[PDB]
Ligand binder design. Structure first.
Ligand SMILES: Nc1ncnc2c1ncn2[C@@H]1O[C@H](COP(=O)(O)OP(=O)(O)O)[C@@H](O)[C@H]1O
Lengths: 49, 48
């Protein structure tokens, strides 16, 4: 029936093409894309205002 | 700053854009190597 959510993770050597597949899937399913780096953060407010 | 804080003024970049009056100047960040990476909000994330 209806649309459904799910979580996933990818891992491997840097520069294998990961993010590129991300956006390609986003234009495959037609869902909207939005990158969000979180490297090195400690500000929970960034995740919650 | 947010402009709701008292005394807020636009960030440095807007001033350079205001000053050079063109859309495509040649910004020159200087001395990137010693940027202050502290607990008070690390600019190095802001540069990205
Ligand atoms: N199999 C592939 N198909 C398409 N692009 C690839 C492939 N392998 C590497 N790339 C290129 O590698 C670069 C980095 O890929 P990406 O996963 O988006 O970033 P990172 O690799 O840092 O995670 C991209 O510009 C992408 O085009």
């Amino acid at each position: 029936g209806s649309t459904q959510g799910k979580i996933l993770c990818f891992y491997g050597p840097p520069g294998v093409g990961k993010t590129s597949i991300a956006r390609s899937i986003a234009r495959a399913l037609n869902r909207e894309y939005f990158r969000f780096s979180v490297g090195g953060m400690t500000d929970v407010a960034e995740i919650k205002g | 700053h947010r402009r709701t804080y008292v005394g807020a003024m636009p960030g440095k970049i807007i001033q350079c854009l205001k000053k050079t009056k063109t859309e495509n100047p040649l910004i020159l960040i200087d001395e990137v190597d010693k940027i202050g990476r502290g607990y008070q909000g690390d600019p190095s994330s802001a540069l990205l």
